[PDB]
Design a binder for this molecule. Structure first.
Ligand SMILES: O=C(c1cccc(Br)c1)c1c(-c2ccc(O)cc2)sc2cc(O)ccc12
Ligand SMILES: O=C(c1cccc(Br)c1)c1c(-c2ccc(O)cc2)sc2cc(O)ccc12
Lengths: 154, 156
């Protein structure tokens, strides 16, 4: 069983690496790193509900959109964490690029990210990204509310 | 090997400290800073301003606990999942948290959120703790209006 666990972890790490380094036109094929029922998406949004893209086909369709609205996106400062689960990885990184979001002025978006990758049978079953949406608000020209700190110590 | 045994031992001990931290609640929070190195850092990495709020030093962490017990009087971490990593001195935690929020100048509220924690260790104690959440949920708990990204132009 330890052999099976070890085997899984090394292959899955390569897939996380490939995902995090997928750039440009290659993003159109990134969904091939998922299971047929794989899910990806953004877990931290203004509404408090995740935005999940469900299914390898819908993920492939969505990459076409992502290529237009984040045309030069790169992940940077990539740190991949294996865990005691050979099928679960976490990634700490930054990301940056132009943001061309429908209905908003073209801007530049930079943020810190955490990604969760869960695997099934050698491919990604669930990818989740977590960030501070306040930085995406700023990139879109949306006013960020400020918590009053006057009464706080520091 | 002897080096592998030392890494296993460090990871097992550090996991116990992460567990203790995550289950520390009530008055015990006043002593949670003893789980840190003398120069340890803790705090909140995701805020409205985009800059972390870092509390630097075991002494300052203990002093800050006094404020934390006033403004989050009954905080609980729930749904705790602890992740060891290939670094015996680096752990991640996925969890939820809940409690009253009693922030100066705001109405008393109830705050619920999802959290990720990072714990880095030195010599058996916490050198750096960092907390990551979506601040929009804390805005809601304080009665602060959350801006809405318009979705009309997006694929549905
Ligand atoms: O930036 C995204 C995004 C980008 C790529 C994938 C995913 Br999933 C989400 C956001 C949205 C989105 C939703 C549906 C789409 O088809 C396209 C974009 S809504 C929204 C609200 C926020 O407060 C912050 C970010 C977003
Ligand atoms: O919740 C906290 C917080 C930060 C660090 C430790 C603890 Br405990 C709580 C926030 C603040 C704070 C700052 C300085 C203090 O001394 C006490 C509170 S400001 C702010 C702004 C946000 O948008 C969201 C959260 C906070």
């Amino acid at each position: 069983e330890n052999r099976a666990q070890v085997a899984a972890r090394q292959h899955n790490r390569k897939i996380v690496e490939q995902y995090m380094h997928t750039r440009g036109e290659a993003r159109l094929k990134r969904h091939l790193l998922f299971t047929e029922d794989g899910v990806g998406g953004l877990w931290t949004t203004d509404s408090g509900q995740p935005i999940a893209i469900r299914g390898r086909e819908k993920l492939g369709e969505h990459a076409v959109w992502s290529l237009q609205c984040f045309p030069d996106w790169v992940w940077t400062d990539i740190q991949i964490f294996e865990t005691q689960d050979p099928n679960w990885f976490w990634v700490e990184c930054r990301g940056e690029g132009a943001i061309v979001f429908p209905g908003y002025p073209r801007g530049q978006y930079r943020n810190h990210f955490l990604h969760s990758f869960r695997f099934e049978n050698g491919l990604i079953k669930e990818q989740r990204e977590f960030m501070n949406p306040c930085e995406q608000f700023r990139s879109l020209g949306i006013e960020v509310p400020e918590v009053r700190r006057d009464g706080l110590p520091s």
